[PDB]
Design a protein around this ligand. Structure first.
Ligand SMILES: O=P(O)(O)OC[C@H]1O[C@H](OP(=O)(O)OP(=O)(O)O)[C@H](O)[C@@H]1O
Ligand SMILES: O=P(O)(O)OC[C@H]1O[C@H](OP(=O)(O)OP(=O)(O)O)[C@H](O)[C@@H]1O
Ligand SMILES: [Cl-]
Ligand SMILES: [Cl-]
Ligand code: NA
Ligand code: NA
Lengths: 320, 320
């Protein structure tokens, strides 16, 4: 049995979504320990693939992947037990991350030492984002540079959409705690919404790159907490595309974001994609704990925990 | 004797120079083999420091640095022979690069294995740019994230100005040739000019970050030659601050840039800082050679050569 552990992906924002930029997409993101993945891959005695833990959507994709990889690497039929599943469609990058974790695990069970980028590609993942792919096996803080726009992009709708973008920035995240918040956000509809908001104005695409590459990244690099928070907040309460994500989601997340900005125990707060997960940074975590406990009791958030960044990516060890 | 070789620094552009951005400065740059530095540091028998090769400006700073480092590391008086000096104030980053090269060399002569960032700082270098500091001992292609703007930046003139910025992006440069061009550019006056052009509009600061981080860098990362050139050109013929550098310099460089854009054997061209050095990229270097030879004969450029990127930084070896 191979026992794989992997961090969740928290996303800051999408970058280039205008009708005239050289490239499209591009994502700033970081990895954290909780919520985490823990799965155990081993030989199925009867010779039939199996998947335990996790919801039906990923459960089938897990099986399809393991069926695929079986004949790819000529390995055995494998049972995987997801002991700790990453919350699905909650803004944690669960599908990409689990698939790569289990995939890498099934590889180690065989002989192979797979490349996660080509594995992601094999399994149909990372056709918009390199975030979760990058964050497996590097962890930390990264920004991928998206995809090159073809000559006939002046028209767009290619923003909606194989080749998973490599990280153009990749840094260790400082030893700062991260407060995770489960809001009452929900998870067609958005396909329609996406076309109503995008393509965004060029100025904003540019500005987002500015806040990501000349705000977030240098501050992470230099371990400047104040500078880091100033950039996280400016993205959250000001990022054109982020605002659209927030506004669409509604009061359920907006109230929590606003409360964090108000709260003096919270130095910055963010939404991860659209999914209910928000996250926050604080130099007074003891005060923040009490604030989030207060929020959870009142029923404005479902849950909260502190975690820390993962600067490794996934990790495997052989057990029995 | 320690024999040190170091690459030149070619600069693409300065990034954030507006009155309201989170950070200021920020520089995209690459390292090349020619023009290069080659120096040899050894013990001065008579016990008096000495500097041969190079112009009077760096010659004294070389000595001051070696005097400084002598009592810092309690080492011997050292003679340095600059066998191949980097052209001074020509847009090659000669001062920073030589100082760090010779400094690192004098260190190896002693016992120490110096950090180039703290060495740069010790020698008063890299108070605007991390370009040449970064490019010593990493080489390749990098972008530094500048400096954090203080609360009282709304007013500016802090854009003119110790802590040398670390590289937020650092990548191997692909195996593409680089055509270097010595134009008839010249090298107070610009101190005045700088205040007339800066601070630049915010939109442009943002846009420059966009072309650097979502243009240059991903293309370098993915080794996409067409994408790379599209971004280099957009910076050169469109970069607000770059245009100001070009326009100020005048016909001497402008004519060469325009000729490269016209020339079908040149896929992209750039100015390095303001200094006479321009550089260009081509997928038909054989045709480009003939174009530059033609230019040099007519007297529109002083000289030209092809070189390639350095992906190491400086290098030392012990000789006698
Ligand atoms: O390949 P990744 O970097 O993970 O991201 C790809 C997509 O998945 C994300 O959803 P979410 O964060 O909810 O993850 P999940 O849908 O897989 O649960 C988000 O909607 C991205 O567009
Ligand atoms: O510390 P660096 O990254 O080298 O760059 C610092 C400064 O030096 C450069 O001049 P130039 O490229 O002409 O080099 P030189 O003046 O040292 O010759 C340029 O004017 C930069 O503002
Ligand atoms: Cl804690
Ligand atoms: Cl060549
Ligand atoms: Na707050
Ligand atoms: Na051309």
């Amino acid at each position: 049995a191979v026992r794989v552990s992997a961090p969740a992906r928290l996303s800051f924002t999408l970058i280039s979504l205008d009708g005239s930029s050289l490239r499209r997409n591009g994502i700033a993101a970081m990895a954290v320990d909780r919520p985490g993945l823990t799965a155990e891959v081993r030989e199925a005695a009867d010779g039939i693939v199996a998947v335990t833990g996790t919801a039906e959507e990923t459960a089938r994709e897990l099986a399809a992947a393991l069926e695929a990889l079986r004949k790819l690497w000529d390995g055995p039929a494998a049972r995987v037990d997801v002991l700790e599943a990453l919350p699905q469609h909650s803004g944690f990058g669960s599908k990409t991350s689990t698939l790569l974790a289990v995939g890498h695990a099934y590889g180690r069970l065989c002989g192979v030492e797979p490349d996660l980028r080509e594995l992601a590609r094999t399994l149909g993942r990372g056709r918009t984002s390199g975030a979760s792919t990058g964050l497996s096996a590097y962890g930390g803080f990264l920004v991928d540079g998206g995809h090159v726009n073809p000559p006939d992009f002046a028209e767009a709708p290619q923003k909606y959409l194989v080749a998973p973008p490599k990280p153009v920035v990749r840094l260790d995240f400082p030893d700062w705690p991260v407060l995770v918040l489960l809001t009452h956000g929900r998870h067609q509809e958005e396909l329609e919404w996406f076309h109503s908001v995008a393509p965004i104005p060029a100025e904003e695409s540019w500005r987002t790159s500015h806040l990501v590459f000349m705000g977030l990244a240098p501050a992470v690099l230099e371990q400047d907490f104040d500078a880091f928070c100033a950039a996280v907040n400016e993205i959250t309460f000001t990022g054109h595309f982020k605002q659209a994500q927030i506004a669409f989601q509604g009061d359920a997340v907006a109230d929590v974001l606003e409360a964090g900005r108000a709260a003096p125990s919270v130095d910055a707060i963010a939404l991860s994609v659209t999914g209910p997960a928000c996250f926050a940074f604080t130099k007074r975590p003891e005060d923040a704990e009490r604030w989030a406990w207060e929020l959870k009791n009142r029923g404005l958030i479902r849950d909260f925990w502190f975690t820390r960044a993962n600067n490794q990516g996934l990790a495997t060890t052989v057990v029995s």
